[PDB]
Design a binder for these strands. Structure first.
Ligand SMILES: Nc1ncnc2c1ncn2[C@@H]1O[C@H](COP(=O)(O)OP(=O)(O)OP(=O)(O)O)[C@@H](O)[C@H]1O
Ligand SMILES: [Mg+2]
Lengths: 997, 301
DNA sequence: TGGGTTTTCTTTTCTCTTGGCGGTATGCAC
RNA sequence: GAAAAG
DNA sequence: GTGCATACCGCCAAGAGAAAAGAAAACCCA
């Protein structure tokens, strides 16, 4: 790779290209001419950048000067140099003989005229100019015609992507003009880059102190606005002086946005800084990320890409709009590509050091520019000026942590002048329009903001380049499934919102999930103060997140909104808006319902009734006929819980999922009071969930008859649970341990239930330490009120044992597959590699767990913060993490593939399908069809030899070493040592009622 | 945690542990008496001795042979570093509470400002003089664990490394830190004994040393209260976080008050470094801030 | 062989590494 | 330091 | 050719922020 300062200079010249500051770039290129120490740092890419810049202006003298610079250091000109020359000669309307001479020289040196139009990444304006320049000399030369788009022909994705089939793709309930207007609304939101929402906290009455503090804060913010502006222009002139002499100043990066936008962003991050201040490097990363994400939107605004996106989008909406018909039905990505696709090349992220210095410069200039009067008690009093922010440190063991903490007077000014509004970033808010179809790992989700295909903690990431090395048709199913998940219109259940806002604004109800305010918090002495601070801080954080979620729910109350979906590195699908989505708590799931509704038909209402029982937590171990009989027994309780939620018999609070049960009670109450219940149009999603879907996939891989009986892959009249049986065995050992000299047996009594061992028995097939089981079986015991708090540790270690004692001689094939996966991960990580595998749908998955992280240091004024490179710069895979991660990551890849196949085959049948991870949601009318499709896709996924295909792929990928195979023959034989499949037959899963229930 | 078999000059340390010959109500809380040779050396003094052995293998013999002592030993199974539970469910034989130990002894000291209630002799392990040294100071300002009832002497063995660093002043500026400031004003720590570390057997090195940990009445003040101590510590660690800076820079990092005004209240003038601070200087820097009652915003802890 | 280090995986909200000195290498004015 | 989802 | 300013790297002390409570055993550096 290049040097660090080489990256600084390359980013400098690229940002001078994007700020249209060519004399500055030419001057700094001239200053590094005349020395050898830093012209050695100058590489061909920087000269090509200045080459292209002077090309786009039509300048020929500087063009020839840069050519002489390239030939002066012995550097050979590249394809981009001749493309830039042809661009400048096309723009200048050069004489045809000289362009002829240029093309003869270009063909003489060894260039490929055909490859320059394709291999060189360049805009369509550059393409048109170079095409005109060539065609003035060679008018018979032409580019190859566009091929028809490829069609994926894998066996699992053969029924989809087959044109000889009867399809009924579902269509949105909104017409073409409405969706165009929603597109314009979301475009304006993403151009504005921020959303202001009204807080759902009850308003404080106007007072003299409130408005006085309001005016004081407004005057202070205007003073800071002018101070930030003055400091920004003084820094701008200092950095321009530092560019005239040859130095990397960060001047074009500060010229990437207008001054008002940078001052506005700095005022925003000043506003959104808590009383306990955030880490300094967190502010640096946040400011760099916000500057980059606003530069992206500004660049598409200036370049004309927004208008092209509009022109493509109003044509794309004819596929989804109800009133508009396409001539040939097709998938959204296929209609995006069959329509003339707008050009969207990836924009490269900034170099991470330069990101850090931009963030640090903005943070330092915010710290220095803002000053407040120290004595706010008397405005007429003369007061010295103190900084609004301070650099405190916090020490954790060896660690020294820099924190920017606000002034306590500024904080007291913030809570005294309570702000009625709240501000969100536009990517943290649900989309008002259907998202862009995922046509590549670079285009999709939000309209103008870049969204990653795979979620990652680190900035530099191995997953995206692996997503790009694969064949183009490999990711087609995953992209179409993510598009289908994002193409689900959501709306807010306003009644549940009314009840939760009723309880939030008053004294909260902590048992239902509505947080209580710290005004109701409790208020040897130091022990009481410490407990008061701890409880108050926990309640305050909980109510803060509830305030954010409820404010977003109130904002989207009358709007149809879409949640674009993203992946993790293992393939599971997460909606991009973080606060308000259907993967959240019971309250958030109760708020959300489908916007398009389906008539219930002949079997809808029954499923709704079953769903209600499924949300009570009662009759979990009963057949569906017993669940429906129970729902018919408690119908009056359902009607009273719907009609009188907080003023009646309050049955729904006793449910395991109370707000969801209340919403389903309202849906059932509306449906049974309809004149024709088949004609009732229902918008409430109905959920089908797998009983230990990890065990389901494990038994499907191993073909274990006992496991496929135990988790419902074998047909049965009753549902089967592993948790109840194991908990019964633990109660047998607890009764055996009773009436002896052990106190924990009589302490436990009836606290051994499904819930306390649920997490452990769920986990154990993913290798769990005996120490982690203590923490795993103590929070569930700590939340119990009848449990004594003294014996939490004793009962925790009592439930660590007698569970693994109960789980011995159980799940033999599952444990064998676990052991083989664990040893394969251990030996792959032990040979200095990361574990990599391909899903049956073709998605490549790699594990980013490396120890000994590479660290670098920034020299600065306020402090020196350490930043970590993780984009393959670390060269040691972390064996413990790979071992502990592979047996769950493979199963998560498998059930993500199952969900994607179920989604793609339900889409062809006109079904609205969404999914929480292993919980498939659809309309109550379509549940059986979904069930049917689910079962076939399970049988279609597991008819394929996933273990054997994984083994031979692992042999091809990780066993091809020229010399390392001598020591790697042991891992070669362990990859060829899948345990044999048992005697379970998969088409019985087609007849399994309680597979998903 | 070392089991010492050497009897070398045990009488001299026993007599300096004894103090006044007339009074044997002073008790010796001997920690880790494995072989019991040091136990017999402490019994040669004639005062009552209580053992706090924690290892289960050496504890059954420790209850035995106490009849020959005619009641000079009350064996309690615990360890001196844990005492008051921090994240604790029930009582286990390795760790008990201060109330249980003090009710077994029966000794309770209502006033802190009176004469010393009790004496503790002990050791620190090969790794962990810093952790338990931090722990005793945490117990010592806010009255917790062994210091919870009274002003108990903790006369004990330390490494020589600490006795260089903990008794450091701005003289010898290379080794100087926060435990130095806390302990040198907290206790009057003098010279007792200087035995070699490798001379003592364990069931090329820094030499062992012995210190007197005796708290001072000057500790708790109208401005330095036992409840404000965590405000105090965040000065000392932050001021030594970057130690080549003036105290004005660290006060502007830690306090919204005019630092130069605080320095013209204490006396040092505007160039003066955190390394050139005596331990009492940090205490005075803490308490000059407090009496400005009009300025309510005093700290950024 | 003896001793320091972590405790199944993913995701989200709340809000947890820096500093000082000294030595070595390199580039520039007289 | 806490909470939630799978 | 020589001395001084600048930038980069090593390296131990960080005060190994108190948990030195804890049933539990395997992994990597010494
Ligand atoms: N803690 C966890 N560790 C690993 N995988 C987990 C964990 N929690 C959930 N999963 C994964 O999510 C799925 C289980 O989710 P869920 O909470 O519904 O449990 P379950 O045992 O399937 O539930 P139920 O029996 O109540 O229907 C499996 O695919 C499993 O691999
Ligand atoms: Mg489930």
């Amino acid at each position: 790779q290049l040097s660090g300062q080489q990256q600084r200079l390359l980013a400098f010249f690229k940002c001078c290209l994007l700020t249209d500051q060519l004399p500055l770039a030419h001057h700094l290129l001239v200053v590094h001419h005349g020395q050898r120490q830093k012209r050695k740092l100058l590489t061909l890419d920087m000269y090509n950048a200045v080459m292209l810049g002077w090309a786009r202006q039509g300048a020929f003298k500087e063009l020839v000067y840069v050519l002489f610079m390239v030939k002066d250091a012995g550097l050979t000109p590249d394809l981009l140099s001749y493309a830039a020359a042809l661009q400048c000669m096309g723009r200048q309307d050069q004489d045809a003989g000289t362009i002829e001479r240029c093309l003869e020289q270009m063909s003489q040196e060894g260039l490929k005229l055909q490859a320059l139009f394709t291999a060189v990444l360049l805009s369509e304006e550059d393409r048109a100019t170079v095409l005109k320049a060539v065609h003035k000399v060679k008018p018979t030369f032409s580019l190859p015609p566009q091929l028809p788009p490829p069609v994926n022909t894998s066996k699992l994705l053969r029924d989809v992507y087959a044109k000889d089939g009867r399809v009924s793709y579902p269509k949105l309930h909104l017409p073409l003009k409405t969706l165009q207007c929603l597109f314009e609304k979301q475009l304006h939101m993403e151009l504005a880059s921020r959303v202001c929402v009204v807080s759902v906290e009850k308003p404080t009455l106007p007072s003299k102190e409130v408005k006085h503090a309001r005016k004081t804060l407004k005057t202070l913010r205007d003073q800071w606005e002018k101070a930030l502006c003055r400091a920004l222009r003084e820094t701008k002139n200092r950095l321009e002086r530092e560019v005239y002499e040859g130095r990397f100043s960060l001047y074009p990066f500060l010229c990437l946005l207008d001054e008002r936008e940078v001052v506005r962003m700095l005022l925003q991050v000043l506003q959104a800084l808590p009383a306990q201040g955030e880490s300094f490097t967190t502010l640096a990363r946040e400011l760099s990320a916000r500057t980059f994400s606003r530069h992206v939107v500004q660049r598409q605004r200036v370049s004309g890409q927004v208008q092209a996106l509009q022109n493509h989008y109003r044509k794309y909406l004819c596929l989804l709009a109800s009133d508009a018909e396409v001539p040939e039905p097709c998938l959204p990505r296929q209609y995006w590509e069959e329509l003339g696709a707008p050009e969207a090349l990836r924009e490269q992220p900034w170099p991470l050091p330069v990101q850090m210095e931009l963030g640090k410069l903005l943070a330092e200039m915010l710290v220095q520019a803002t000053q407040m009067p120290c004595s706010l008690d008397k405005p007429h009093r003369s007061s010295r000026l103190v900084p609004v922010l301070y650099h405190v440190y916090s020490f954790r063991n060896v660690q020294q942590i820099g924190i920017l903490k606000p002034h306590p007077a500024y904080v007291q000014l913030l809570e005294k002048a309570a702000e009625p509004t709240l501000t969100f970033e536009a990517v943290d808010v649900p989309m008002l329009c259907p998202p862009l179809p995922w046509t590549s790992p670079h285009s999709g989700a939000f309209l103008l903001s870049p969204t990653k295909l795979m979620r990652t903690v680190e900035g530099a990431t191995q997953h995206q380049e692996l997503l790009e090395t694969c064949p183009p048709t490999a990711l087609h199913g995953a992209l179409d499934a993510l598009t289908q998940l994002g193409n689900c219109a959501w709306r807010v259940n306003g009644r549940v919102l009314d009840l939760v806002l009723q309880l939030f604004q008053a004294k909260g109800c902590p048992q239902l999930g509505v947080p209580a305010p710290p005004s109701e918090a409790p208020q040897e002495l130091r022990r009481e103060l410490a407990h008061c601070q701890k409880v108050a801080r926990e309640m305050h954080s909980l109510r803060a997140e509830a305030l954010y979620r409820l404010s977003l729910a109130q904002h989207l109350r009358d709007r149809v909104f879409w949640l674009p979906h993203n992946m993790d590195f293992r393939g599971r699908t997460y909606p991009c808006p973080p606060h308000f989505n259907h993967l959240g708590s019971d309250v958030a799931r109760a708020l959300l319902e489908f916007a398009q509704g389906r008539p219930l038909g002949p079997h809808g209402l029954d499923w709704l009734k079953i769903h209600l029982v499924n949300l009570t937590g009662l009759k979990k171990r009963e057949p569906l006929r017993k669940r429906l009989a129970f729902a018919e027994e408690v119908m009056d309780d359902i009607l009273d819980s719907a009609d009188q939620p907080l003023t009646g018999r309050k049955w729904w609070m006793g449910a395991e999922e109370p707000w969801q049960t209340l919403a389903c009670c309202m849906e059932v109450a509306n449906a049974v009071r309809a004149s024709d219940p088949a004609a009732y149009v229902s918008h409430l999603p109905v959920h089908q969930d797998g009983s230990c879907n990890g065990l389901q996939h494990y038994a499907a891989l191993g073909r274990d008859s006992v496991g496929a009986a135990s988790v419902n892959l074998e047909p049965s009249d009753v549902p089967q649970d592993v948790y109840s049986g194991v908990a019964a065995q633990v109660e047998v050992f607890r009764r055996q341990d009773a009436q002896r000299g052990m106190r924990v047996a009589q302490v436990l009594e009836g606290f051994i239930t499904r819930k306390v061992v649920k997490q452990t028995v769920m986990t154990v097939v993913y290798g769990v330490t005996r120490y982690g089981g203590r923490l795993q079986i103590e929070k569930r015991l700590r939340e119990l009120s009848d449990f004594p708090q003294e014996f939490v540790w004793e009962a925790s270690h009592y439930l660590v044992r007698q569970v693994f004692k109960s789980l011995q001689e159980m799940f033999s094939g599952t444990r064998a597959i676990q052991h083989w996966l664990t040893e394969s991960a251990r030996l792959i990580s032990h040979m200095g590699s990361v574990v990599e595998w391909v899903t049956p749908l073709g998605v490549p998955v790699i594990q980013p767990y490396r120890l000994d992280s590479k660290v670098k240091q920034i020299g600065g004024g306020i402090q020196s913060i350490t930043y970590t490179h993780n984009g393959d710069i670390s060269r040691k895979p972390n064996t413990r993490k790979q071992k502990n991660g592979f047996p769950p990551n493979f199963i998560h890849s498998l059930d993500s593939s199952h969900m994607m196949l179920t989604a793609l085959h339900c889409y062809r049948k006109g079904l609205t399908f969404v999914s929480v991870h292993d919980c498939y949601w659809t309309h109550a009318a379509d549940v059986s069809v979904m069930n049917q499709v689910c079962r076939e896709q399970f049988v279609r996924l597991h008819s394929e030899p996933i273990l054997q295909d994984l083994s031979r792929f692992l042999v091809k990928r990780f066993c091809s070493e020229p010399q390392k195979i001598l020591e790697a023959s042991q891992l070669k034989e362990t990859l060829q040592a899948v345990p044999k499949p048992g005697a379970f037959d998969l088409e019985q899963v087609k007849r399994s009622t309680y597979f998903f229930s | 945690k070392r089991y010492v078999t050497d009897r070398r000059l045990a009488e001299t340390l026993a007599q300096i542990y004894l103090g006044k010959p007339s009074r044997p109500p002073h008790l010796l809380l001997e920690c880790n008496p494995g072989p019991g040779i040091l136990t017999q050396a402490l019994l040669e003094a004639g005062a009552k001795v209580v053992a706090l052995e924690s290892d289960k293998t050496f504890i059954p013999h420790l209850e035995s042979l106490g009849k020959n002592l005619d009641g000079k030993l009350r064996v309690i199974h615990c360890d001196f570093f844990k005492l008051d539970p921090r994240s604790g469910g029930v009582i286990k034989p390795p760790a008990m509470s201060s109330r249980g130990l003090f009710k077994n002894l029966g000794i309770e000291a209502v006033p802190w400002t009176a004469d010393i209630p009790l004496k503790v002799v002990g050791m620190f392990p090969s790794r962990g003089e810093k952790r338990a040294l931090w722990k005793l100071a945490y117990d010592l300002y806010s009255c917790t664990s062994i210091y919870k009832f009274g002003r108990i002497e903790v006369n004990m063995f330390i490494g020589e490394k600490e006795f260089q660093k903990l008794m450091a002043d701005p003289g010898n500026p290379d080794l100087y830190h926060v435990l130095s400031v806390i302990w040198q004003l907290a206790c009057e720590i003098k010279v007792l004994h200087m035995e070699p570390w490798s001379s003592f057997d364990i069931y090329l090195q820094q030499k062992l040393y012995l210190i007197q940990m005796i708290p001072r009445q000057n500790l708790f003040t109208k401005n330095l209260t036992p409840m404000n101590y965590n405000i105090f510590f965040h000065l000392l660690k932050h001021c030594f976080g970057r130690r080549s800076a003036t105290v004005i820079d660290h006060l502007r990092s830690l306090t919204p008050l005019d630092a130069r005004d605080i320095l013209m209240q204490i006396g040092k003038q505007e160039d003066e470094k955190v390394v050139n601070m005596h331990p009492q200087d940090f205490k005075t820097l803490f308490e000059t801030i407090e009496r400005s009652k009009d300025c309510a915003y005093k700290w950024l802890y």
